[PDB]
């Protein structure tokens, strides 16, 4: 299973790293026009949030060498013009942030990819949750597919389980979210929200999350039951879902945790965590889970209505979906 | 007025740069062991959160002089010992945090103090929110009183204006929240809460807030409906509620404009304040209100769910109502 | 004397706010096409780093009014086109970044600027330091000048008085310097300088700095004798160089602090200040000065070898600096 | 070799984290009266910056079991009374940072520690940099020795590199310093040293650095011709040493590199590193060198002025470094 990454930002990067844990997949290519062959290696082998790249790095007869792999690269702005075919490109994972629709991003099909995974919600494509809706997936009606986003994968597992034990009648969600490449570092233009210009580091800055529309979708039973927004925090990454619903079933906080400590260890084993530990966010820096449920931090006010709170890395756990995606995808 | 100030800390200096800007109101007399006269004129003149003092400051025959006032200056460890009635100060700020019970806060009184403001919450002195319970003062019973908590003091007008027009069914809070001095710069010691002694400037922490609690005894209809958390977050000064709540009457997200914008205009003008504007948590710091309405940032979820956003400088907004309270208990 | 801004970035709108303590300077256009009449009052009035705005702003008929003055918007991205005659701009300071060389700035003098200012270093157009060189400026052959760069306007007086005073044989400098907009949030794309992508808030950061090859300009005695080097930091504002230098005749820190503060009081005064407090960072944000010598902080190996410290509000001290060039270039 | 540890800090969890790496040395016992038994295990399994535990942990019959290795557990105040020998503690690394002299530290032998590593300098102990003179530890006349400070690990190695090449007529230092745990979140009290009392994260703070005092015991020929001062600045760790000294001998910077480059490869293995890539402070989180210096950043004013920058990560290399001290002490 080939895949080829379009845009080696954060999440293009940390897709590369993530396949290295998993056999069947093997990243071919990979195009970005701000990032040469020489500056890849570099970005890739240091990061600020994730530390040093433990495997061997090379650039060799014009191809980025990672434990041994050879990798080509590619510097073309219009995605119709890369040619994933020539390079082996089944699946390409579309990551810079601005082909998000069905059109846009079906231009990889040009180059002769066969499925495009957009790493972010879509206005149209159909977006998948790991763990919630990935069997909605059709193989050859849909081409052109959506991850959801970082805030939706950690939302929806604990949302499922939550509806399916006891019934959401009605909830609100807030993410505390870690800046990314988006926001800037000091006051700077930022023309459609005002918000996201203000300096990052400075600021506690509320915003939109895509969980706030794509929950609706991954869930059809929810939809218009549950909806949200973010705060832009001073983190490099990881984040937390503070999830505030009525449920239909009355039930106590013991059997809430007993239902997702048993979904942690079954059903969506790898996608959702469960701890009962002490924690803070920079514990889950690196974690691969789309959700780790915080046993301790949350409220039960009544039998029906609590506060639950979930954890994610928002770089590293979304990245590891988006294989898992693939890897699911392939098999058909 | 006529007010002495137990403790330098964080709340003690800022009440006093507070009070220079009330003309009701002047401080005659502080105490701080752990502070000489220098030093507090140099942690009083240079402020990392809210900028130099621009006034002018002095320090002559023993006395700290602020504006032309001098001020006299002890550093006692036991409030029994400050002579209070020396200097003719009739209302004492406690905030060092160590004398949270009417019992301990009540040693003042035995150093010819009249009435004591605990700049904290207390487990058993009766605790007030400007603006929602500061008539059940009564000045024949009540000699030491707590002015409660800032995330306090950001809730309750909020949750007044919301409940008496909408009645308030359940609701849950969380306050994002600025890190404080109980807090560490790396990972420390915090025997009893272990998430505190995790480095402030790293994490997201949950936590507890005083709010919890308080909210329901300057409200009492909202007892046991209201409760919530805390999320310490990496930034110096200023927090955020984030309250969602359930109503008994259904409505839209422009009539709940509606009834804060115009509680903004008159009984709580001061206290709570309103605003369309796209800000972020930077606008406020050295903000003087309790509670500032976000209208932007607010969602209804459905007629009867809704989540309310309203921020608050934790520092400035909670030292500018523990003077309107001396003022308000003073007056009789 | 009338102004023109293009560019209302970190600095633009800086200049603007400085404006308005100088009374003979009146801004009377601002050209960015990247932020539109609306924007640019909401950013002009709030500021992460300097806090809110004190006058008064409005949007009307197609016009910025600041403090009752109307000011000319537009929204072209070739400053050829830009009609500075019509809206009565003299002088244009040229604070995009972008347009650096003689060649590009002179285009603001189609459209009918008279002088053009550049916010930064050149290649070519003639470079000025208040308080340094600032005698050098003709008239009647310079239409495109530099103000240097912030580092430059900090090193270069203090430089000039060490240099004067004790002769400077060889030196070398480090400035820790606040991040900036040419900064990333999070690791991404900076293909030139490959750490200055990287994270600005995780990251101590080594860097050029415009001082480097500026000062040998701006005093041309101390060309080949005196260079350095920047490291990026995580604060939002505030930098403090840190020259170490030999110098020809043996002195006594008691001298070198007795000559800068002479420096202080007389030849240049509001460009160079001294004090002998316990600062830090914060102290100096909105400070006006080029450079404020820390007496307490330098260090006196031996009588011929010497480390200075010296603050610099990198944002705040530069854009009063454009001012006071404008001004200065005015009074021919 | 079998070791104890006083104060459970960052630099006690650090060491016992290093520890684990060398296969001789053994952490038997540890003595923190802050830190209960099961606290000990959560503080050291989860640690801000340097990530997760990898291992095993385990609380069990009053004892703290990691890898399967029991370490007795203490809770004592005065180091006098803890009893090394009963644990089987040969050597204790005294990590508590107030017991520094010699006489005090002294006070471990009467529990029947044979050795004494003060992890800081000392007034009077002997100080050691592993590199740069352990060769004078005299296992006949010294019991309590210090391991200097992690600033003073990374100037040393470099300085006498230089000095024994080139050699060092005079300089100065500064090192851009990490935050530690004696500073603060918000501004608080510092009655000695009023700099270190301000807020941590909002403030580059300059302060004083040990290397400035211990770098002339460790390199003697040095005394009175090296010294500097630090600035505290907003990373967790990762701090930076800038070097700047004039040379009798004069040379170029290539040569100083294939030097310090053959040293890094040779004698200095382990604890000075070479690199020439274009790095940041959070590419060395959990580096375990004393000094990494960084080729690319230097810089050459003429053949006999240079400035140099060497990296360290003032936790975990100044922690692997004590374990090196203890396993050189332990041959003998
Ligand atoms: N990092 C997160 O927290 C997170 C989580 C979930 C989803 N996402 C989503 O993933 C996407 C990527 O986000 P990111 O955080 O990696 O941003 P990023 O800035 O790190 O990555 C974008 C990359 O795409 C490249 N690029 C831009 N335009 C291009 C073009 N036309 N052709 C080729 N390459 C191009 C850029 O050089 C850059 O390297 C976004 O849509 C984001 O919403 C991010
Ligand atoms: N800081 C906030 O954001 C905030 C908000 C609302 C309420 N409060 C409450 O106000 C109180 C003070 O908080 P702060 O932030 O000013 O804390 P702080 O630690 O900055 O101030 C405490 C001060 O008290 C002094 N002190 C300690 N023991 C003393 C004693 N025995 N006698 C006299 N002085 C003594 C200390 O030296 C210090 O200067 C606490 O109870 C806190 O919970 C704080
Ligand atoms: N902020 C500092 O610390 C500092 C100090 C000294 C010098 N400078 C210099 O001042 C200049 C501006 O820096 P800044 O910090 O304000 O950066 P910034 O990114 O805040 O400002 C740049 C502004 O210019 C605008 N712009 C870009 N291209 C344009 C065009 N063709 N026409 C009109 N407007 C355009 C952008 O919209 C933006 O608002 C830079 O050259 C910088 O080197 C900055
Ligand atoms: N972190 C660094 O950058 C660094 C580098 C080199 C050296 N050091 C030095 O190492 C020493 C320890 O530093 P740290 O970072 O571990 O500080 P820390 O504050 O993290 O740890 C100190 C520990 O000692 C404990 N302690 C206090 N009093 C005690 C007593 N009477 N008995 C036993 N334990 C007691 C505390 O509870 C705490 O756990 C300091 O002297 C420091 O100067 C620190």
């Known amino acids: 299973v080939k895949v080829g990454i379009n ?22 290519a990979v195009n970005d026009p701000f990032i040469d062959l020489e500056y890849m290696e570099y970005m890739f082998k240091y990061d600020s949030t994730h530390g040093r790249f433990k495997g061997t790095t090379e650039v060799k007869d014009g191809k980025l060498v990672i434990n041994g792999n050879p990798i080509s690269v590619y510097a073309l702005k219009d995605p119709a013009a890369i040619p994933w075919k020539e390079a082996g490109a ?23 990819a066969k499925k495009v995974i957009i790493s972010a919600p879509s206005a149209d494509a159909p ?19 959506s991850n959801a986003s970082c805030t939706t994968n950690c939302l929806a597992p604990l949302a499922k389980v939550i509806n399916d034990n006891f019934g959401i009648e009605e909830g609100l969600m807030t993410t505390i979210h870690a800046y990314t490449a988006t926001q800037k570092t000091v006051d700077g233009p930022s023309g459609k929200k005002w918000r996201d210009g203000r300096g990052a580091n400075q600021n506690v800055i509320p915003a939109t999350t895509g969980a706030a529309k794509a929950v609706g979708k991954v ?9 949200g927004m973010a705060f832009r925090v001073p983190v490099p990454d990881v984040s937390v879902v503070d999830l505030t619903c009525r449920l239909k079933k009355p039930t106590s906080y ?8 048993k979904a942690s260890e079954t059903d969506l084993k790898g996608f959702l965590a469960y701890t009962e530990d002490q924690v803070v966010s920079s514990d889950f820096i690196s974690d691969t889970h789309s959700s780790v449920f915080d046993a301790l931090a949350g409220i ?6 609590v506060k639950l709170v979930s954890w994610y890395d928002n770089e590293y756990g979304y990245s590891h979906r988006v294989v898992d995606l693939i890897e699911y995808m392939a098999t058909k």
Not at 127 to 145: L, R, S
Not at 254 to 261: D, F, L, Y
Not at 300 to 305: A, K, M, R
């Open 7 to 28: 845009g080696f930002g954060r999440i293009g990067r940390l897709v590369m790293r993530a396949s290295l844990e998993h056999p069947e997949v093997q990243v071919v």
């Open 90 to 112: 089944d699946f390409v994972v579309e990551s810079t942030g601005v082909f998000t629709t069905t059109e846009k991003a079906s231009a990889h099909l040009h180059g002769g």
């Open 127 to 145: 977006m998948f949750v790991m763990g919630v809706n990935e069997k909605t997936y059709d193989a050859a009606t849909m081409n052109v597919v």
């Open 219 to 227: 869930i059809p039973e929810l939809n218009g039951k549950l909806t």
């Open 254 to 261: 013991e059997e809430i945790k007993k239902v997702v400590k």
């Open 300 to 305: 039960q006010l009544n039998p029906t209505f």
